[PDB]
Structures are given as C-alpha cells and as structure tokens.
Amino acid sequence: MMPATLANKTFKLNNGVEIPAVGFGTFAAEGQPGQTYAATKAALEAGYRHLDCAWFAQNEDEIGNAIADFLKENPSVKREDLFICTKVWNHMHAPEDVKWSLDNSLKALRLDYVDLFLVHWPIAAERTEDRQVKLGPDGKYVINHELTENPEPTWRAMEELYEAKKARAIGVSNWTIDGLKKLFAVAKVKPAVNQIEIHPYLPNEELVRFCLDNDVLPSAYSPLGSQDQVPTTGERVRDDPGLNAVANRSNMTLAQALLGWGVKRGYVVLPKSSTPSRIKSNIEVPDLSEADYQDLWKVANGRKPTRFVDMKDTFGYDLWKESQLE
Numbered sequence: 001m002m003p004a005t006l007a008n009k010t011f012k013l014n015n016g017v018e019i020p021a022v023g024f025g026t027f028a029a030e031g032q033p034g035q036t037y038a039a040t041k042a043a044l045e046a047g048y049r050h051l052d053c054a055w056f057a058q059n060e061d062e063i064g065n066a067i068a069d070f071l072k073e074n075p076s077v078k079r080e081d082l083f084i085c086t087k088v089w090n091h092m093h094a095p096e097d098v099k100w101s102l103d104n105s106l107k108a109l110r111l112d113y114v115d116l117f118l119v120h121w122p123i124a125a126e127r128t129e130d131r132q133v134k135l136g137p138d139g140k141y142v143i144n145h146e147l148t149e150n151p152e153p154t155w156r157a158m159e160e161l162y163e164a165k166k167a168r169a170i171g172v173s174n175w176t177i178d179g180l181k182k183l184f185a186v187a188k189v190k191p192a193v194n195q196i197e198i199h200p201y202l203p204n205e206e207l208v209r210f211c212l213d214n215d216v217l218p219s220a221y222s223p224l225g226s227q228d229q230v231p232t233t234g235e236r237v238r239d240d241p242g243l244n245a246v247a248n249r250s251n252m253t254l255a256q257a258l259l260g261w262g263v264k265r266g267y268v269v270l271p272k273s274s275t276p277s278r279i280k281s282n283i284e285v286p287d288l289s290e291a292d293y294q295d296l297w298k299v300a301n302g303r304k305p306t307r308f309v310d311m312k313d314t315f316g317y318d319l320w321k322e323s324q325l326e
C-alpha cells in the first residue's frame with residue numbers, strides 16, 4: 001500500500017482522453033493457459049486501471065474474462081473506470097483487416113469499445129486466407145512494401161474506427177521520428193500515443209521529445225528492461241548496480257525506482273508480471289526525489305544504448321538500421 005502512489009496520476013492525450021500513467025502489460029511469451037486471467041485479475045484487484053493488450057499476444061479472451069469477473073465482483077467499478085488498449089498486428093494492415101482485427105479483439109475482450117487502439121508496428125505484411133502471418137521461403141514475414149511505406153490506408157481505417165466511436169483514441173507503436181513526420185503529413189487525426197521501448201538502458205530521449213513536442217504521448221514498454229538479457233555483454237537492467245543503489249538508498253524496489261523515473265519523465269509505463277507479488281508491488285510507483293531522478297539519469301547517460309526488442313530476424317525487415325559497427 002502506497003498512499004502517495006502515482007497509480008492515481010493520469011495524462012491527457014491530445015484529444016482530451018485521460019490515460020492512467022501506470023498500465024499493466026499482459027503480454028507473455030510464456031502464456032500459459034490461465035496465467036493471463038490470473039495476472040489480469042490480480043492487477044485489477046491491486047489497483048491497476050490500465051490494461052495493455054494486443055492481438056499478437058493471443059490472450060485477449062482470458063483478459064476479457066478477467067475484466068468481466070472483476071467488474072461483476074465489484075459493483076462500484078464500471079467499465080468506464082478502466083482504460084483498455086489493444087493493437088493490430090502486421091499482416092492486418094489492410095483497412096478491412098484492421099477493422100476485422102479490432103472487432104475480433106472487442107469480441108475476445110467482451111467489450112463494446114477500446115480506449116486506445118494502436119498499430120503495433122509500422123510494417124505491413126501479407127497474410128494467409130485464415131488470417132495468419134504468411135511466411136516466405138526463408139521463414140520470415142512477407143513484407144507488403146506498398147502498404148509499408150505509404151501506410152495512409154491503414155491509418156484511414158484507424159481514423160474510421162476512431163470516428164465510429166469503437167476506439168476512444170488511436171495511435172502507433174514502434175514509430176520513428178521520420179515515420180511520425182510521414183503520418184502527420186498524411187493524417188487527419190494525429191496519433192495520440194506512440195508506444196515504444198523506453199528504459200534506462202534505452203532512454204530514447206530524442207524520440208521522447210519529438211513525440212512530446214508534437215502532442216504525441218510516449219508510452220514505454222519494457223520499462224523494467226525486459227524478459228531479455230543484454231546480448232553483447234550479458235547484462236540485466238534490473239541487475240545494474242547504480243539503479244539498485246538509488247533504489248536501496250530510498251527504500252524502494254528497483255522496479256519501483258525505474259517506473260518512477262519513467263513517469264517523472266512524463267510518459268506512460270507498462271510493467272508486466274505474472275507473479276502476484278510483483279503485480280502488487282509494481283503499482284506502488286513513487287514520486288521520485290530530484291536526487292534519485294538525477295542519479296538514475298546518470299546511470300542511463302553513462303551507457304551505450306541497448307535495444308532489447310528488435311525483431312529484425314523475424315520480420316525480415318530492419319526498421320532500426322542498427323549494426324555491430326557504425
């Protein structure tokens with residue numbers, strides 16, 4: 001129990017929608033049936049009012065069941081009290097496919113609408129007749145290059161879903177500054193959120209500015225590092241001695257310190273956990289003192305950026321032209 005927790009703080013998107021600063025990440029590549037339901041229920045009962053989902057996670061049915069059961073067990077809570085965000089995957093970038101994805105997600109979550117609908121990646125890919133990712137002879141995504149660099153159709157579909165009041169806000173994920181310039185050029189409805197990987201080992205400071213200065217709210221996934229360990233040196237963010245020192249001196253958890261850092265920078269954080277204890281503890285986001293904030297920033301600035309989420313080898317498409325040399 002943290003009375004002064006930032007789990008009550010919200011941000012106001014550029015269309016006036018309120019989004020809780022802390023949201024629960026439901027993606028596990030460990031899914032394992034019943035885990036998503038249990039974790040989502042634990043998060044709702046721990047005080048989370050923000051749920052991050054995605055068609056890619058293939059767990060929206062359990063999330064919807066959890067939401068239904070929670071709302072049924074607590075009459076004082078309404079669906080309007082919850083902020084539900086879901087995303088459309090890469091093979092469904094065709095406008096009809098985008099709409100179908102949103103409808104499928106709504107059916108699974110047992111919701112009439114979502115508060116945030118995000119295009120998961122700026123990469124349109126081909127699909128099979130049964131709405132599965134089409135693999136090529138190399139076993140990698142079959143890229144639709146036309147829809148990939150002139151993504152206006154996709155965004156139009158999103159705008160329509162926005163105007164059909166099926167999504168209260170629409171946005172992008174893993175977008176770049178140049179991609180954002182592209183979309184602004186072509187968009188009628190400016191994206192409200194750009195969900196990206198932000199953490200002390202990948203501060204993403206330049207993109208965080210571009211978004212904030214253009215009325216696009218960043219949303220940080222993998223805010224605790226990730227379920228992944230640094231390849232080039234075998235490092236975990238949550239093992240970093242400086243981060244742990246800052247957390248220990250102020251009698252808070254390392255994850256709490258990282259989440260407070262993120263929220264103090266002014267963006268949303270999406271911690272994920274299957275463990276009940278971590279789900280309870282992650283919601284107790286502290287309002288960092290200036291010393292803790294500056295020291296965490298020191299740790300972040302003393303390092304080579306490290307990006308833990310790069311699916312280059314799966315998509316067969318290098319969005320972020322990052323190489324060993326150079």
Ligand SMILES: NC(=O)c1ccc[n+]([C@@H]2O[C@H](COP(=O)([O-])OP(=O)(O)OC[C@H]3O[C@@H](n4cnc5c(N)ncnc54)[C@H](OP(=O)(O)O)[C@@H]3O)[C@@H](O)[C@H]2O)c1
Binds near residue numbers: 024052120223227
């Ligand atoms: N392209 C995208 O849009 C995108 C990509 C990736 C992720 N996301 C979103 O961001 C969310 C989180 O990103 P992530 O998957 O990299 O996970 P994360 O939030 O960065 O960190 C979670 C990892 O650290 C552990 N953990 C959680 N809380 C902890 C705590 N207090 N203390 C110690 N360990 C803790 C977790 O263990 P346990 O799981 O066992 O509890 C798990 O191993 C995802 O759920 C997803 O919603 C979006």
